[PDB]
Amino acid sequence: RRNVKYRRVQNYLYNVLERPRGWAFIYHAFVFLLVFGCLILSVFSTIPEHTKLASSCLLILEFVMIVVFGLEFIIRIWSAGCCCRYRGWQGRLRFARKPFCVIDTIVLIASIAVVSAKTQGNIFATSALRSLRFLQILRMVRMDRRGGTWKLLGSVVYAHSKELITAWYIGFLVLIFSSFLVYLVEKDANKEFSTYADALWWGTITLTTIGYGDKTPLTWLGRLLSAGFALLGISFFALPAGILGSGFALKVQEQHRQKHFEKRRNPAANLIQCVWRSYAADTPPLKTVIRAIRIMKFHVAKRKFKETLRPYDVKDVIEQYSAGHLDMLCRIKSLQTRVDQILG
Amino acid sequence: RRNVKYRRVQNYLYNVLERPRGWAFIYHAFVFLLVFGCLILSVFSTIPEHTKLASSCLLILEFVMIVVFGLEFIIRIWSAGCCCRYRGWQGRLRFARKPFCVIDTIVLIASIAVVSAKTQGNIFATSALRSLRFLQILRMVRMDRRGGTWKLLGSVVYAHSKELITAWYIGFLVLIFSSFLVYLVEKDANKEFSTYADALWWGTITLTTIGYGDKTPLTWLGRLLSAGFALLGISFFALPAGILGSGFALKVQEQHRQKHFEKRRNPAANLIQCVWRSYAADTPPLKTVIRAIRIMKFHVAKRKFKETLRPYDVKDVIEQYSAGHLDMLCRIKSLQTRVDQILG
Amino acid sequence: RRNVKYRRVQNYLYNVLERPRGWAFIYHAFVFLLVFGCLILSVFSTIPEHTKLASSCLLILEFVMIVVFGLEFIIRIWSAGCCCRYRGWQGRLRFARKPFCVIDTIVLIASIAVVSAKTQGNIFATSALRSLRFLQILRMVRMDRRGGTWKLLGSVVYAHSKELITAWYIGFLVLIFSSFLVYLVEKDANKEFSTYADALWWGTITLTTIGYGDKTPLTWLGRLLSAGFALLGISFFALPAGILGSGFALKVQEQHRQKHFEKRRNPAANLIQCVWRSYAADTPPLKTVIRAIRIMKFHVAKRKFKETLRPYDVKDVIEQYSAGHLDMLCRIKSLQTRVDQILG
Amino acid sequence: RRNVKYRRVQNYLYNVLERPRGWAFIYHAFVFLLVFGCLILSVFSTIPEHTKLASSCLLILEFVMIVVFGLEFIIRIWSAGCCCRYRGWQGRLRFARKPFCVIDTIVLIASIAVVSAKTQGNIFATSALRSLRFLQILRMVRMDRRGGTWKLLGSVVYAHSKELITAWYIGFLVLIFSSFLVYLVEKDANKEFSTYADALWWGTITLTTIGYGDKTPLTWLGRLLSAGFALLGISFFALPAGILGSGFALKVQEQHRQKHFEKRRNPAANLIQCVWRSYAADTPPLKTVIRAIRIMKFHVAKRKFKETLRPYDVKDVIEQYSAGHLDMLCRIKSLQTRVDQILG
Amino acid sequence: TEEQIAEFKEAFSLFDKDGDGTITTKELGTVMRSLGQNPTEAELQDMINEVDADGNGTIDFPEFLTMMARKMKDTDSEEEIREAFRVFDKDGNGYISAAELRHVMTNLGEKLTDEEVDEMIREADIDGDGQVNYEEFVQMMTAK
Amino acid sequence: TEEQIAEFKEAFSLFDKDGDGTITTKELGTVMRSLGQNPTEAELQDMINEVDADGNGTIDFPEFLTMMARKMKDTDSEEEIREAFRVFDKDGNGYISAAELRHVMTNLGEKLTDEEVDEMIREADIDGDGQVNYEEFVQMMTAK
Amino acid sequence: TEEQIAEFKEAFSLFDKDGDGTITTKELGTVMRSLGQNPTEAELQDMINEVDADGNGTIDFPEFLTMMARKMKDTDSEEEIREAFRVFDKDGNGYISAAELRHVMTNLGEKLTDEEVDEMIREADIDGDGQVNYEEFVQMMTAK
Amino acid sequence: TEEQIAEFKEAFSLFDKDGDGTITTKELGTVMRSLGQNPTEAELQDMINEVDADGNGTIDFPEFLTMMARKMKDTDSEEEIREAFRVFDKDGNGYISAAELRHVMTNLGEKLTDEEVDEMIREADIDGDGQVNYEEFVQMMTAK
Ligand SMILES: CCCCCCCC(=O)OC[C@H](COP(=O)(O)O[C@@H]1[C@H](O)[C@H](O)[C@@H](OP(=O)(O)O)[C@H](OP(=O)(O)O)[C@H]1O)OC(=O)CCCCCCC
């Protein structure tokens, strides 16, 4: 009872920490905000006109950081042990074996080292201090499970590889050609367009629409060519962003549609029921063979539980109603045969 | 008759004011244009080279503003009372209880205060005058019912949260990394890249494609790294806009499709007809129980009127024709059984 | 025969001129290129360092322009008269009644006037000459039939009005708020941010990503606020372009799908066949009433030819197979009834 | 056996070279990286402050380039001869007849010429050397088979031609109008807006969002007009990129859907089986006519193998189930007729 | 409310026909079919679910009494009725034509008998250029 | 127009077969089926709606007279016919081949009898490398 | 394991009913139908494929012995069971209500007999405000 | 080619069975059904269209002679065969397994008799770790 609730809440802590959902996301948003504030203060520490106050406030914020992350670290260890897979010393050690748990461990000891060096003032530590500060991004890095973001990006980039390559190829050709032409037109009148490398820098800055203004064509012919090629190249340089964004949005729409068409509920219940059957399994030989058949049912329902995980297709219902067609054919055949039997 | 038309037009005024549609939108476009003109003149009042004429014309425009909004305010109160829910003094008070009605009230009295202070010239009022001018945006703020716009934005942001976070994470990593590298390359040759915070400012300005030009890499290696990372980062910074725009467009397409598939007409008519039945309701006990059953029908048709509000799904017709399949199965079964009866 | 071919080619000329398709588009691309070259030379005439050669070449190009457009004008009149609706003097006059024909007429006489004034050198004409040059864009303006482009744009803008307004509202709020905050932070340290109007100019230039660089925040707090609000505002300012582009692309996809689902072929053939029936129409009273019925068939098939113009819907096939369901129901009912008759 | 493996590996080399897939793409990514490095070093050779080291390293990199491309060239010839179509001297000559093979040949001999001229130092060669360096892009140019990228781009541009033209027309009108208005407002106060051509340059730079800053409006009215027209024009200039990106993404989605609906497997197997039948073909006259009929089956299955290449359509299944309807109609008709026969 | 509860109990005993004290789908279906309705089993399930509040699936006497206690004329009911009328509105001007309403009541949803439809059309003022307000209708039929 | 109105009245009396003075779907269907047509009820509804202009659903004598008064040859009718011909055009050159037109008239839409099709093909000039203008057709069949 | 292999061989001989030494779809279907199951041919194919590892399509005695050798209680099996339970979880708190589980077992998937369902519900602690942990269930039914 | 044209004429007379000199869908269908094929009317239409080059819809003797004159072994035919084999290729290495090819020929498309399939499998070298090149197959079956 008491211990029961003890482990129940321990499990809830595990959920909020290692299984973000709902307000646990609010909790992790808060810790991300703290990490981001630490990073901003670390950056401001670079400025000499603010280095004194930046570092002064950064010392206290780093103290708060170490306290909160140590508390989260120990609570995470305990709650993870809750799950009966990381229970006990051996299970806690296994949880620590996680790459992100060890990463948290190292960043935490590093942070303590930062604080101690600050207290001391060691020049060697002082020099290392900024690199140590950089480690805090590791918190956000950890917040991404199994590199989800990365994978997602890669997926889309691979899905649209042909068109991304098309955009890159055409844009690169436009960049090279326009840069060369503007170089030729302005190699003499304009000093900033002295070397073709400078023209390439101008072309890259222009076509991306950054337009610093450090190099700008002056001769009217140069400005005309720059205008035309700038139109073409800005379009082609903006392409990849547009292609990737449209890919992301269409992917979301597909995910939504698949979610709506999710029919896995009933086969998943079949999997659960056959699991219960296999449990009930565990005439001696008849019982043993019945257990074997129940295990086979368990595996079959798992396969069904997996083929449901495969999203929906219209081709599926095309085959479904196609089965309807064969059905009606056979049906009418039988009907006519038996009615002929009647006539006889 | 006369009073009948009186309330009829009063209701039309309510429609044009609190229920924009068609030309009422033209009417509200006009008032928005007046608010925007007042805001532009208020801004121009800031410029000292034009402050005299700006304020001179702004006095008359503010006078016109107070007149027109007072007229709209009183007409709105009256027309709202038209609706039989805000009728009478109590109903007018209830309408004033609306948050936007009280907001209109306060902005209106504030505007009068602006005009009176202008007439007077109180220094304390004068200082407050600009803050008072700011309030006119409250008209546009009110024009958004229940924060519709906000909600819509939020919805899309929540729908694409995973990919927005992906874009933000990758772009932030690119920003940090590229800024650090350009800082390292140009920490000495370029003075504007003196402190890493300056490099971060340059990176933010570059990757967003703002490209002020205040800080630009000079060393050739710095320019090469800047070019490459600028390509990557401009793509990733442009992503969120593209993702949100594609989300908005796909949402519109979905809304359009759902509108076309709207089958709620017949169930809504069923709801109306059962409402009329329940009305007709209002053997004593038999009549009372018939009234009870008619109320049950009313609620059932309301539920049907709601489940129609749920848009269309292909899964729906999949189940529909699936019902067709079971139907045909049973049909053929019965047929064959009775034909066998014949044969017998 | 000879006259037959004469009118046949005259009709082909009409097709290439007033009915662009295939290579007629190549023809009109050429004339657009000539108009664009004339416009570019007219612009270069503005530059004083090139005014002499610009105007020298522009005189000959304008001569060629008048010649080619006069030839196209007369050929267009003749070919239009070909169509048997603009045949004869009255029909040519009717074709001239077209707004674009009269526009071509006026621009052509204006061009002659330009050439004559150039020859003369009248100061009053000279001053008017540039305005006269501007008229050549009227050719492109005419190339758009019934303002197609405009309408299309409007359509999309109306389709996505809610989300465009959302983007505009949020972006305007971000612009105002960020501009005010940066003004407050930099009202003193930075002179270019002296008046709030200057801050608004900076905000507009920043959030659009134009980033001229004329005004840039200097104070570090100003740069931090500028960075954050710039991220948000660049996203929201880029939204409308993304929304409109996605709307255009989705509209194209819808048009393509509708084109594929075009079932109007057979009903259009029905319309043609009933038209031929009505022709064959034209027992006296029996023949007259048969003619009446054939006219009714003609109108009915026209309505069918129109309801086919309505694109395809999945709801349509939903009702179609739904009719299949009622069919099967009735079928099985009849079957069972007659088999029961057999059993009897 | 030994020769068998010899040709087997020779074929694998052909696959990795002329048929990139999987890691062959990794191989070609490497060679593209080498080409790109050569191009970057060639560009850096332009800079005089780095010309010495740039050219020094570029000599060795060009040596490596010639070695690797000669090896790839000969291996490609041999592996292509593997395919039994380019086998033997005649087949190797035919493979060399390929436009890209001859292009590789010429670029390779050109590269040798570059190296020899470098060794010599001929002024005439030296002057030609940079143009010779440019040829290396021909490798990437070759990497595109049958101009795939180009075609793809063209396809989308043709698919969205109407809307691209709409965006271009509206944006051009906005550019001209806004440039003229800003010219009028700032023709006197601002010297950079002296000639309308300068205003056009400013408008092009602004609306594309390049925003160099070389020309910026100063007068407040000029800045107001610039702001408004800049909003409109930046949207319309960003349109084409958005339209093309959305077109690319929707095209990918269509390709994916068509791939999923690919039913060509069974008809392709039918084509293979009838090909085997025609093989088995090759009563004398009966055997000859059977061979004729088998060839007819081969052609029919090829047509079926082609009509499967036509992607899927919902209209297809609409007709499919429509056939289901006629089927059920006929079925029930027959049933009722024969049951009536029973009743009789 | 002794007369009211007595009437409610009389009705509940008429429907129950036994001492069970609860209403099942089958018994309710049979009673309603005694008048010649012929509803569906899903109709019975939905109707009984609309009444029950405990989830057991049977309408006990207290549940029927609670259902019949609440008055039909309610603010939420009035709003639902008004929006339902607005669904088939033209321009949202509060007025509907007699002909279109006749067509809607004769085709859409529960097709009513022409006698009742004519009675309701003649109940209110159908004059006025063929346009009749439905706000007045809403007021009258919610009067209980 | 006394002869014309007399003929129209004779036709209307032939169709009506009674003193009602209006045409219903059932009566029109029976009369047209007397010639062996066998149309659909929806066909009757659409045909009668095409004639009526008051919405009552029956063709009175004035409506039939008004329908038959307007001449078939009309500018809008001519434009509709021309665009319908253009629907099945190749390159929009105003000319169509005899074979494709034969196939269209034999398969698409109302399948006509081969006798009529051959009569119409031979009516106009079918020579000229197998291509015949349809503008000439349009002119002839709109002549009334 | 002599007793275990003897029992496995006894079961395999019961199923085979002949000296073939392999299990075919038809024979397995007949044996299982002898108990009144009436499965499908696709069911037989899937069941036999689940057992076979050589692709021949028949379960030989070694394949059956290997299949029955592995213990049901396995870590991967436990994870699959836990995630299957989580599929129908509310908030993912590890607890499920008795009523919803009853409904799921009575409607979704293989509809079990009420006797077995009541037995399993009473097997564990069903008290606690109507919420029962399924982790405890998972522990008990994986104990073999 | 007198013997070849004589054989072609003998075959054409066998198929025609009359002096018409052309092949219709019905006659071809009856002749092919005499061997027990039972094809479809659409099959007849497609088969005859594959032969005819004039569009009349009947195979005259010259058309059959032209069709049978061209040799089966052609470069375009070889390319089509090679790509068809590649359709069911793994990694595009030019080699296919015996088992997957057996399955494809037994299920996909025209299901052939096992005797013929075994004959063709044994015709070529099926050894080599279960992988057989299909380029060698392509060479042999295109030899005429
Ligand atoms: C960016 C700044 C912070 C953003 C935070 C703001 C973002 C935010 O907090 O979202 C909350 C809420 C999300 O719930 P929301 O109702 O929108 O989502 C519905 C719900 O998710 C269903 O589950 C979906 O069906 P499904 O089961 O999946 O299939 C259904 O999609 P569909 O089937 O109908 O198509 C969705 O409609 O949406 C808002 O109201 C935005 C208010 C914005 C107010 C605050 C705006 C800031």
Ligand SMILES: CCCCCCCC(=O)OC[C@H](COP(=O)(O)O[C@@H]1[C@H](O)[C@H](O)[C@@H](OP(=O)(O)O)[C@H](OP(=O)(O)O)[C@H]1O)OC(=O)CCCCCCC
């Ligand atoms: C931005 C500047 C101001 C913009 C104002 C311009 C915007 C503006 O005023 O739109 C007017 C009009 C809107 O009516 P529009 O015909 O386009 O819309 C149709 C109509 O809305 C139907 O109701 C829709 O079916 P549904 O029932 O919903 O299902 C149908 O969609 P779909 O089913 O077929 O797919 C729509 O086609 O469209 C224009 O002509 C643009 C002319 C532009 C001329 C003025 C251009 C400025």
